[PDB]
Design a protein around this ligand. Structure first.
Ligand SMILES: [Cl-]
Lengths: 213, 100, 216
């Protein structure tokens, strides 16, 4: 029943600050160190430090001392991390983890921090229809900021044969594509719809794939 | 046949020298998994060599919110009295007068 | 600070085989008669997962196919037998002293049978064209190994500029990779040409897999 629920992805301007949360449940919060780990995109893991919520004792990695501030609230079973004077090097996924025993046994899902002066923008969603036995269809999710978007097919009813590609960044904008493979007998008699969500711009787009002809 | 405690320790009684030149300390466990063996070691200042000896036979955490007595024979001169695993690890300085 | 050196950086292991990865500490990570080093597994999009603590103690619920060994400075992680869902990055970590440090990581590749990509080309949609955009999309799906080169041709002439590529991580079930290649052009350039070609050259054939369409 040990769980660590982390706050949502955040965008922060260079030189600004962010405060991230990690809500613990399923154990005595005050009886274990709650630790923070940083992972830059496509990079390794770096230990930031630990907090003991029972007495607010902290141990920091020296390199994060002027950067990170760990706090904990006994009442709400919540740990926080404040990141100051934000620079591009601070854009990363921040994990909270419980040191249950000799090492970190339970981890939060991570909170993504994007340090940027770029503005939130919704994507455009384009259907990808063929221009035998099995047909491949797709959706182009172009020009959005920030990450992430969620892509589903037929509200999640089509999960097998789906390839949702990692987004590519160009001119402060992300572009992503998703492909679905179905039997040729099923399309177009049975409808194929990609469901695109961009939470930062409160966008939910349903795109029906129609045969070109 | 207990495994080592994984949580932290609080100093309840700071190091005191006995009349036999030994040292006594009282630490209280914070954490779980008890009964468990208290991780204890004495090192040189460079933290390269384990020195001295534990006099307390197998110190175990047996009670909630109660101190555990530890007696040890440290080496002559400066040493670190190290208790518990990281990141809560206690690192206490001690100087024992004399020579062998 | 203790440096944890992982070796190799990456390795490809066949299904059912034995995989051994090494992690060397720059100084002893031993305290209290134990080795303060641990192994983690991180799958794409997930947090790290603890496999082994104190060099050789298997975490509760983790398969016995994972084995840790070592003391002082020399440690190994063994996976035997290798399974498809073992496609991940492996990290070693020391917590004998502050700061706690991680190894750079070892990416484990599952070596299955070679598979040619299923190639699909897509013209720009009407929706995109009405807004002066023209993205030509090409999927190259479920192939093995990951090494592939995509070549775009506009009326038979190669085109390198305006091409963006994206690869998926190795599939946890079938051990394949998939790739999308997008050629973005202006509506103007798109409308002045007819033949659009996506050519995939993969280990599986000396002949390229060529998919194309005519704008008409
Ligand atoms: Cl840890």
């Amino acid at each position: 029943q040990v769980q660590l629920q982390q706050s949502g992805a955040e965008v922060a301007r260079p030189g600004a600050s962010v405060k991230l949360s990690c809500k613990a449940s399923g154990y005595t919060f005050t009886s274990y160190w709650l630790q923070w780990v940083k992972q830059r995109p496509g990079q390794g893991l770096e230990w930031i430090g630990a907090i003991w919520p029972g007495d607010d004792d902290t141990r920091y990695a020296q390199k994060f001392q002027g950067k990170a501030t760990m706090t904990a609230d006994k009442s709400s079973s919540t740990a926080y991390i404040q990141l100051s004077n934000l620079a591009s090097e601070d854009s990363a996924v921040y994990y909270c983890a419980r040191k249950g025993g000799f090492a970190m046994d339970y981890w939060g899902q991570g909170t993504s921090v994007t340090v940027s002066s770029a503005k939130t923008t919704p994507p455009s969603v384009y259907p990808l229809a063929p221009g035998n036995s099995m047909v491949t269809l797709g959706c182009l999710v172009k020009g959005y900021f920030p990450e992430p978007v969620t892509v589903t097919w037929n509200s999640g009813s089509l999960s097998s044969g789906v390839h949702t590609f990692p987004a590519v960044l160009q001119s402060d904008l992300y572009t992503l594509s998703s492909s679905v493979t179905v039997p040729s007998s099923t399309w177009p008699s049975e409808t194929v719809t990609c469901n695109v969500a961009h939470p930062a711009s409160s966008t939910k787009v349903d795109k029906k794939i129609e045969p070109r002809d | 046949s207990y495994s080592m405690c994984t949580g932290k320790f609080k100093v309840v009684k700071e190091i005191a020298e006995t009349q036999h030149g030994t040292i006594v300390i009282r630490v209280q466990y914070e954490g779980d998994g008890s009964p468990c063996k208290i991780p204890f070691e004495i090192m040189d200042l460079e933290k390269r060599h384990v020195l001295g000896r534990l006099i307390t036979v197998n110190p175990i955490v047996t009670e909630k919110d109660s101190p555990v007595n530890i007696e040890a024979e440290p080496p002559f001169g400066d040493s670190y009295i190290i208790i518990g695993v990281e990141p809560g690890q206690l690192k206490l300085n001690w100087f024992k007068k004399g020579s062998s | 600070n203790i440096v944890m050196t992982q070796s190799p950086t990456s390795l490809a292991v066949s299904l059912g085989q034995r995989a051994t990865i090494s992690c060397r500490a720059s100084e002893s990570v031993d305290s209290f008669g134990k080795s303060f080093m641990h192994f983690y597994q991180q799958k794409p999009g997930q947090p790290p997962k603890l496999l082994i603590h104190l060099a050789s103690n298997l975490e509760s619920g983790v398969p016995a196919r994972f084995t840790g060994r070592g003391s002082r400075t020399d440690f190994t992680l063994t996976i035997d037998p290798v399974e498809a869902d073992d496609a991940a990055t492996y990290y070693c970590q020391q917590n004998n002293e502050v700061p706690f440090t991680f190894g750079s990581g070892t990416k484990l590749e599952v070596k299955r049978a070679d598979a040619a990509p299923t190639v699909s080309i897509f013209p720009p949609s009407s929706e995109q064209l009405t807004s002066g955009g023209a993205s030509v999309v090409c999927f190259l799906n479920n192939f093995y190994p990951k090494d592939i080169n995509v070549k775009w041709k506009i009326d038979g002439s190669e085109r390198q500029n305006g091409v963006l590529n994206s690869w998926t991580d190795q599939d946890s079930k079938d051990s394949t990779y998939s790739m999308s290649s997008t050629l973005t052009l202006t509506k103007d350039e798109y409308e002045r040409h007819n033949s659009y070609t996506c050519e995939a050259t993969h280990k599986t054939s000396t002949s390229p897999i060529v998919k194309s369409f005519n704008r008409n």
